[PDB]
Amino acid sequence: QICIGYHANNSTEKVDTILERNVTVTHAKDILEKTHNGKLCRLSGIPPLELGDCSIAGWLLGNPECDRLLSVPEWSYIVEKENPVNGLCYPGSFNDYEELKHLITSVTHFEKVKILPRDQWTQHTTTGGSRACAVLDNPSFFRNMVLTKKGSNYPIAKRSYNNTSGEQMLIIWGIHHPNDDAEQRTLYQNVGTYVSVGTSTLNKRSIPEIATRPKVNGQGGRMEFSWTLLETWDVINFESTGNLIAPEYGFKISKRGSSGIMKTEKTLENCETKCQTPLGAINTTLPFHNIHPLTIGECPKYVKSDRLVLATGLRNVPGLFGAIAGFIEGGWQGMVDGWYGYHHSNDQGSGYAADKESTQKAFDGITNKVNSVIEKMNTQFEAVGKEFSNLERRLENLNKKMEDGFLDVWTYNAELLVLMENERTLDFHDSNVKNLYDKVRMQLRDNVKELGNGCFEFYHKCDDECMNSVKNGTYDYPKYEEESK
Amino acid sequence: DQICIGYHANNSTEKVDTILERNVTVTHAKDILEKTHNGKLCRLSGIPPLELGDCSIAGWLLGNPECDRLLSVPEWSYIVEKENPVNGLCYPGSFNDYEELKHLITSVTHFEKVKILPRDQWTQHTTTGGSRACAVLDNPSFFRNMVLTKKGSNYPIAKRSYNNTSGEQMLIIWGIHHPNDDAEQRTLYQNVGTYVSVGTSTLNKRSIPEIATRPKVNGQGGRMEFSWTLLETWDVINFESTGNLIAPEYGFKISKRGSSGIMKTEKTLENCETKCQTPLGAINTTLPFHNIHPLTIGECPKYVKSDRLVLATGLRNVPQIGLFGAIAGFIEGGWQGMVDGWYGYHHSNDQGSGYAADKESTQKAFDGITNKVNSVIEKMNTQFEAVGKEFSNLERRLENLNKKMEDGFLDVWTYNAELLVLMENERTLDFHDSNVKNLYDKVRMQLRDNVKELGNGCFEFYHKCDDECMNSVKNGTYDYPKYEEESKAA
Amino acid sequence: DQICIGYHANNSTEKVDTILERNVTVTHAKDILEKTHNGKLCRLSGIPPLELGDCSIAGWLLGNPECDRLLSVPEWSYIVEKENPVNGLCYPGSFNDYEELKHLITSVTHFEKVKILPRDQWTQHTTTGGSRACAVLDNPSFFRNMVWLTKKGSNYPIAKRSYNNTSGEQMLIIWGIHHPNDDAEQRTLYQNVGTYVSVGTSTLNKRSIPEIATRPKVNGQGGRMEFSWTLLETWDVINFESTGNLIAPEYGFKISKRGSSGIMKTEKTLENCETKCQTPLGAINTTLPFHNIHPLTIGECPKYVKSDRLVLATGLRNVPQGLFGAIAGFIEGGWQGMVDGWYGYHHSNDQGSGYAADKESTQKAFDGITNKVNSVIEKMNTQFEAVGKEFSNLERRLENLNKKMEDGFLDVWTYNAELLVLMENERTLDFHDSNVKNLYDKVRMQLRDNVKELGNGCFEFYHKCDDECMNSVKNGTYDYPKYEEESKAA
Ligand SMILES: CC(=O)N[C@@H]1[C@@H](O)[C@H](O[C@@H]2O[C@H](CO[C@]3(C(=O)O)C[C@H](O)[C@@H](NC(C)=O)[C@H]([C@H](O)[C@H](O)CO)O3)[C@H](O)[C@H](O)[C@H]2O)[C@@H](CO)O[C@H]1O
Numbered sequence A: 001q002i003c004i005g006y007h008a009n010n011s012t013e014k015v016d017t018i019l020e021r022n023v024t025v026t027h028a029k030d031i032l033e034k035t036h037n038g039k040l041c042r043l044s045g046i047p048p049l050e051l052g053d054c055s056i057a058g059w060l061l062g063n064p065e066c067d068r069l070l071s072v073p074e075w076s077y078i079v080e081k082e083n084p085v086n087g088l089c090y091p092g093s094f095n096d097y098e099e100l101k102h103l104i105t106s107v108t109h110f111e112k113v114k115i116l117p118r119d120q121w122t123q124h125t126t127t128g129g130s131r132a133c134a135v136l137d138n139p140s141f142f143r144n145m146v147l148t149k150k151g152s153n154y155p156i157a158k159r160s161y162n163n164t165s166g167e168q169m170l171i172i173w174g175i176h177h178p179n180d181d182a183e184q185r186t187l188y189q190n191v192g193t194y195v196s197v198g199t200s201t202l203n204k205r206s207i208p209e210i211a212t213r214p215k216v217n218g219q220g221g222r223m224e225f226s227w228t229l230l231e232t233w234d235v236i237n238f239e240s241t242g243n244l245i246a247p248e249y250g251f252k253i254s255k256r257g258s259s260g261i262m263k264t265e266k267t268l269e270n271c272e273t274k275c276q277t278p279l280g281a282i283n284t285t286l287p288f289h290n291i292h293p294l295t296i297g298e299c300p301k302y303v304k305s306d307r308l309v310l311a312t313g314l315r316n317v318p319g320l321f322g323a324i325a326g327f328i329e330g331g332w333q334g335m336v337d338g339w340y341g342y343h344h345s346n347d348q349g350s351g352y353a354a355d356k357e358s359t360q361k362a363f364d365g366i367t368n369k370v371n372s373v374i375e376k377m378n379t380q381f382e383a384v385g386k387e388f389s390n391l392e393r394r395l396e397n398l399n400k401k402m403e404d405g406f407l408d409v410w411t412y413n414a415e416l417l418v419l420m421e422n423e424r425t426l427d428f429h430d431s432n433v434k435n436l437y438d439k440v441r442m443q444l445r446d447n448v449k450e451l452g453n454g455c456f457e458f459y460h461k462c463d464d465e466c467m468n469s470v471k472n473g474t475y476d477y478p479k480y481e482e483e484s485k
Numbered sequence B: 001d002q003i004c005i006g007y008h009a010n011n012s013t014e015k016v017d018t019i020l021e022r023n024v025t026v027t028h029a030k031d032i033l034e035k036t037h038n039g040k041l042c043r044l045s046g047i048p049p050l051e052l053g054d055c056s057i058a059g060w061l062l063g064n065p066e067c068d069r070l071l072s073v074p075e076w077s078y079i080v081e082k083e084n085p086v087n088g089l090c091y092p093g094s095f096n097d098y099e100e101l102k103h104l105i106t107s108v109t110h111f112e113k114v115k116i117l118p119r120d121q122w123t124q125h126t127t128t129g130g131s132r133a134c135a136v137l138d139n140p141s142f143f144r145n146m147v148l149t150k151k152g153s154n155y156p157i158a159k160r161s162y163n164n165t166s167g168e169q170m171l172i173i174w175g176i177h178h179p180n181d182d183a184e185q186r187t188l189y190q191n192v193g194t195y196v197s198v199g200t201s202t203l204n205k206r207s208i209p210e211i212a213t214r215p216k217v218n219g220q221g222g223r224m225e226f227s228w229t230l231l232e233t234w235d236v237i238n239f240e241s242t243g244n245l246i247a248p249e250y251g252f253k254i255s256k257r258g259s260s261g262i263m264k265t266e267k268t269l270e271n272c273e274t275k276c277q278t279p280l281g282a283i284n285t286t287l288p289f290h291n292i293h294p295l296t297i298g299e300c301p302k303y304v305k306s307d308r309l310v311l312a313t314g315l316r317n318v319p320q321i322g323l324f325g326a327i328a329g330f331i332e333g334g335w336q337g338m339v340d341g342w343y344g345y346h347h348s349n350d351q352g353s354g355y356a357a358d359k360e361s362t363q364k365a366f367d368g369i370t371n372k373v374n375s376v377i378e379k380m381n382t383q384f385e386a387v388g389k390e391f392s393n394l395e396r397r398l399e400n401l402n403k404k405m406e407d408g409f410l411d412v413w414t415y416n417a418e419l420l421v422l423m424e425n426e427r428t429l430d431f432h433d434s435n436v437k438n439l440y441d442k443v444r445m446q447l448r449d450n451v452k453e454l455g456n457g458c459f460e461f462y463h464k465c466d467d468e469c470m471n472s473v474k475n476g477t478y479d480y481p482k483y484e485e486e487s488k489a490a
Numbered sequence C: 001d002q003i004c005i006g007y008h009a010n011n012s013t014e015k016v017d018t019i020l021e022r023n024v025t026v027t028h029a030k031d032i033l034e035k036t037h038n039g040k041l042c043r044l045s046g047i048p049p050l051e052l053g054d055c056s057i058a059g060w061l062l063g064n065p066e067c068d069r070l071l072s073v074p075e076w077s078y079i080v081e082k083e084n085p086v087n088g089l090c091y092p093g094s095f096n097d098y099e100e101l102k103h104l105i106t107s108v109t110h111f112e113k114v115k116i117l118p119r120d121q122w123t124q125h126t127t128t129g130g131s132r133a134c135a136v137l138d139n140p141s142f143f144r145n146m147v148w149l150t151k152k153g154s155n156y157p158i159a160k161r162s163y164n165n166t167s168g169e170q171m172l173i174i175w176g177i178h179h180p181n182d183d184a185e186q187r188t189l190y191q192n193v194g195t196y197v198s199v200g201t202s203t204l205n206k207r208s209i210p211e212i213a214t215r216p217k218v219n220g221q222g223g224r225m226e227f228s229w230t231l232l233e234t235w236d237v238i239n240f241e242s243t244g245n246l247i248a249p250e251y252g253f254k255i256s257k258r259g260s261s262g263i264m265k266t267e268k269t270l271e272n273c274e275t276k277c278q279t280p281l282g283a284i285n286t287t288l289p290f291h292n293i294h295p296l297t298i299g300e301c302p303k304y305v306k307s308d309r310l311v312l313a314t315g316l317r318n319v320p321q322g323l324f325g326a327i328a329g330f331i332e333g334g335w336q337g338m339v340d341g342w343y344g345y346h347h348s349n350d351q352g353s354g355y356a357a358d359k360e361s362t363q364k365a366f367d368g369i370t371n372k373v374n375s376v377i378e379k380m381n382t383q384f385e386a387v388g389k390e391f392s393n394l395e396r397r398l399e400n401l402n403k404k405m406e407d408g409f410l411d412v413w414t415y416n417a418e419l420l421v422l423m424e425n426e427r428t429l430d431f432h433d434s435n436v437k438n439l440y441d442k443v444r445m446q447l448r449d450n451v452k453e454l455g456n457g458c459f460e461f462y463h464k465c466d467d468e469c470m471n472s473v474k475n476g477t478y479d480y481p482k483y484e485e486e487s488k489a490a
């Protein structure tokens, strides 16, 4: 006789299908990335800027507590602790601050340059500081910033700078808001002052806004900062009748795109990644992951899922077409070089021979299925975490609804795709075995008896040569047409 | 003697579509599209909406006299307004960052007013000033939550502060009055060249009054401009004014339980419960989709632009007087007389005849189709959302972006829903076809040449097959060798 | 004598992909990805775009002399500009909420410039002032819709005028303030120092003071003009008041809107064609659900995907000489000789041979595959959208959010369109394979043992089968008993 059979093994891998849960299969492929390396890493060769617990404002203004910082000239993203300790040491605010953060999120070059040496403010006092910025602990001040009356006069404070640096330049300035009209006169002599800044494209003025306020870092006063991007060869003009907090430096900046800020206590560790999360980096070909929604880089789609396992092998039995676990009741652990094949028995022996033709065709098909699911997934650079101020709650919620919206689409589609394709893979195997069975059946015709269990019992002697012809589709029916029926 | 293989039919006229075929009549079906609502405005997880009627949130917080019996509740999970609330700034003017204020109070768990600046302590200023714009019966009146004009012929500097000892963050509103003319300025405040300043740990503002002729609104060329801040616990707010300050008398303690939204509808609350509210009524469903209204609040099915999503659960209904070729194929029709299963046998022998369901195939199909339905339904994620959003008339672009987002997901879900239904119905009908073909073959491969295939799902035995014999056929233990009585064939 | 079952083949070199297999040649196919356009800028549902060419919207509404008789239409559906317009604020400055204003006039049902404040009626001021920045041929000029108010002799008295919107429609009105480079300039032009510009309607109240400060020369000028706008409601009044530095409108624009749209950037000019879907490369006219022409569309468009190709198999695998084992299986090749159907018979007997399509199964398959193609196309919901948006340089995060949203939908639709094609193509090929298998079994069950089943789709008769008999096989009326007395010899 000769029987048609299929592979079984010792596998305990389970998959789900649209019709059935926890099916054991001989082989399966997990498409959900669940692991990371526990490290903060460089992105495509370039490290993050690490701010420790300094804020971007604290760093750029020169909060004295941010002195021992260490600022690379180039970075691919920014790492901050969740709530930075050192920001505006002299209390106040920073206009369009989240727009500024977004801009410097990834740069190809960054370099501080002295643009308005403080000693050239020759008719104002320049040494003013505050205990709120105290070092050691004498009053001090933002190290990058500088004006009060000299003797008893505050003449117009007017200076300009031409960006001949070769790159666009980031420039910050501020205006001080005193406690009361008496302090206004003490510091700046005149009341009703202004700070004007102008370039070819920016025209901005602030005036002092005096109010009674509780002390913050010991001070009732506030400083309000603003910023601009000065283009190559343009001029910035400062013009103030008082209250100006002038920059001494500006920042040369070249951008190669935008990135984002990552909130984490982790420190850079000298490895390479293409996809960073606050928990660690991911290195994967898989199309989905569930590590963390706030990633930076070229990452798989984040889904709300614990498990996405594609079946690749067949039901492990140690279907639509009725053969596997069907009229062929069980698998063969003894057939090791194929998914499908034969067992024979005659005068010369017995028995297993894998069918390489249908096995290979199936392997190729399932390889294509898997490649299709994984490769079709687009993966461009994105930074998920975003910055919004406390008066942009609606905009932060819009962003959230959008991220939530995409998370629902992808999680549902990923779960359904796996269930549907798993059903079809199981049926594909079932069909391949049925077809191999019928291939034999249709060769033998009435020269053999169809037992009903996968086996054919010949009506003639069928030796090893005969058997081989049955297995490769060249069985000579007329030759044995003598039936003994 | 004979045994026939067949499948259930009934009196169903339910129709489904499939990828390959439209309006296929099936024996059973299940709609996964929620189309009904209860006509009521409900509580959401036990917690009622704040019902503002035709007052705006401004009108309510300021204390527009037309809102007086507003009936504010301690706790709320969303806010209900009429489409265009008529009672707002009774004295005309504006409200800075109003939408962000509306977003913040959309869902709160403790809401309590605190009389932070008792009006009676403004002892050196007049405090009863009012307007016919806010008239009550029909005397001049004013926002009940707000208060300053000269006392006699003097307006001394006005200076008061409040330390938030209330135990929670506090919402505080104040305004400035922009008079129509210098004479109004002098009448009200005596002083000219005035200011209003307010400071906290994080707020710093000084406003100066704008005197200018404007068209009259509710009788007034003057305007009032309001602003708001949240005072942190233990922080201090300081007001100082030489004139034109509209002072708050009250602040509002706010503990937010996340965020929700405002629902525009004419409906009023009705002592019912729900997880998903629409302006037309509440939705109570396990279904993954609905088409009732896009502006929902709660944990809602996905909204789609569809009128019907019907999943086949039973087979093609073929009452008598596919891929596998059995159903409506080599087995011509179904059997209304077989009622205890989807698939089975009809037999005839010396003893009688003869319907019997195949409990194995039938149970397969039950479990499989239940799993399919459960998969399509259970795998859908449903998180809390308030769809309708507030944008000012200078935020059209932002409004349009929200719209583009909502429209985009609507097209995604609608297309995927409709196609999933067509595709799964095709597979379902084929699944049943397969189960019938498999049942037939199970019988055929056992019987081999001890019976003849009579065509139409039937086998005629070449031997006597009593009830005991039939059972062995039906449960798959038939004894071929036992029956060579069979030379009946030859 | 014999009859064989077979299927159509031809010389199609059309390839598709399936989930299991790449580059399969099929007899027939259809792309559902729209890749063509008419290369033209068209009317959108009958209504033309406003064509601004190398002018910006600001250049146009203020009346920059280069945007003068720009030639407008009273109605438009979208606005076309060059990518980088040359003519905008010729006197340098800015426009407050400019993007909101661009978005407002993107689509209008009516638009008409009206003279609301004739410049001759500024009797106490000079009205002819201009700038070399706006030079015409080559005398100083100015924005033609605006009036630069300057002093008359040595005096600038209070400038005060108002206008009542009795036009019957809402009216766009624009005004500006001049921020001089220096005190000398302020005095030469306006005489007074410490001036202001005030503007007020029923809902708007604005006061601005000029900012005198040295700035880099733009178009020769260190001064700047800052513009603002408002919509004046029907029968509302706008009040202008100034002691200097006011740039007054002479005109306003009646506007009626019925929805919004967007700005398209392209060099193309309008060409007298019609469309529902404009791209900057040309208009699309398609029923297809997907396209790859250009992401910045305006209208009701297919979904944009990053696919080069989306080809659905419609015919079967082309095997010029599967789950069900017949096509490219035990029936090893297709027949180029069967031209009148997809599946059929080849017969051979005494009278000759012998191709004939099975009309019924062919037509059933055509109906099925037609429903499948229609399903994929017809279920796609489409709505009006203008993809291209305007954001200022301080709106990068908002611009990034918009981009993330578009990239997100691009990812969803691409992945799903591609996999849908792969998956449905696998099912379409198996559907054909099953149709052939079923036709094959129908012949098998008819002939029974009156014929030899060879195993390659052919049946060899144990009796003589003439054309009449061959025909009964073909149409399901073969008479087994009739030839039983003859067949096999036995
Ligand atoms: C310059 C000086 O010594 N001025 C005396 C003020 O110190 C003083 O009031 C106290 O000021 C305390 C804060 O003092 C500083 C600070 O910020 O540390 C002292 C700095 O030298 C001064 N810097 C200057 C003027 O450039 C800084 C500045 O004035 C303010 O921050 C402006 O808002 O103030 C703190 O405010 C105490 O609450 C306040 O009493 C008054 C009273 O002691 O006399 C001033 O001469």
Ligand SMILES: CC(=O)N[C@@H]1[C@@H](O)[C@H](O[C@@H]2O[C@H](CO[C@]3(C(=O)O)C[C@H](O)[C@@H](NC(C)=O)[C@H]([C@H](O)[C@H](O)CO)O3)[C@H](O)[C@H](O)[C@H]2O)[C@@H](CO)O[C@H]1O
Residues within 6 Å of the ligand: B129, B130, B131, B132, B133, B140, B149, B179, B180, B184, B187, B188, B219, B220, B221, B222, B223
């Ligand atoms: C107190 C009084 O007699 N005031 C007379 C002014 O009313 C009047 O100018 C006319 O004012 C008309 C509105 O009258 C009220 C109002 O808003 O109803 C009267 C209110 O008492 C007053 N509120 C106060 C004083 O706290 C209110 C207020 O002054 C304004 O709203 C401030 O903008 O005015 C109306 O607006 C007429 O258009 C206007 O002429 C003058 C001149 O007739 O005499 C005042 O005695």
